[PDB]
């Protein structure tokens with residue numbers, strides 16, 4: 388199993404641990420088996436209990452009010468782990484999302500091990516950079532390169548981004 392994943396957050400830090408003090412507000416993950424999308428995905432919006440930074444809002448457009456009635460990371464953590472366990476996670480700039488995931492897992496105080504100890508982690512951005520050195524390798528740049536539709540991506544979304552990356556990664560490794 389390959390799980391193409393993405394997350395949206397309240398923001399990030401430019402110095403020090405990028406996730407410190409921030410929270411995941413959306414998790415989007417899509418399953419790929421034998422190079423085919425299975426359709427069995429994972430998608431949740433989470434209540435951060437903190438405000439979304441303006442810069443972050445400018446990217447995903449997810450309002451603070453929309454998250455008030457959502458589950459907390461603690462409430463979705465078990466099913467989330469059941470879903471990703473043992474798979475190869477494919478993430479564009481993996482260190483970003485993995486950092487946030489392990490951070491949130493650690494706050495649960497359940498002795499949950501690091502994600503890369505129970506999941507294989509593949510950074511699709513590193514893969515793209517290796518294949519296309521000296522070129523633009525953002526997800527949008529890769530969409531144009533592989534003729535993938537990203538017209539509905541004015542604002543970024545975790546599931547939306549994961550789905551697009553899945554198509555891009557399948558083409559990049561096809």
Ligand SMILES: Cc1cn([C@H]2C[C@H](O)[C@@H](COP(=O)(O)O)O2)c(=O)[nH]c1=O
Pocket residue numbers: 393394395396397398399442443446447480483543548
């Ligand atoms: C592109 C970008 C993302 N982010 C944070 C908030 C987003 O929810 C999260 C998602 O990045 P993404 O395009 O890698 O899915 O990263 C910023 O804080 N500023 C930015 O300029």
Ligand SMILES: Cc1cn([C@H]2C[C@H](O)[C@@H](COP(=O)(O)O)O2)c(=O)[nH]c1=O
Pocket residue numbers: 405479480482483512524525526527
């Ligand atoms: C570690 C890190 C993560 N990120 C997050 C926010 C970006 O939108 C996302 C990557 O977007 P991109 O691979 O589509 O250009 O990852 C950065 O932008 N810069 C960084 O240095």
Ligand SMILES: [Mn+2]
Pocket residue numbers: 393394479548
């Ligand atoms: Mn992302």
Ligand SMILES: [Mn+2]
Pocket residue numbers: 393394395543544545548
């Ligand atoms: Mn995203």
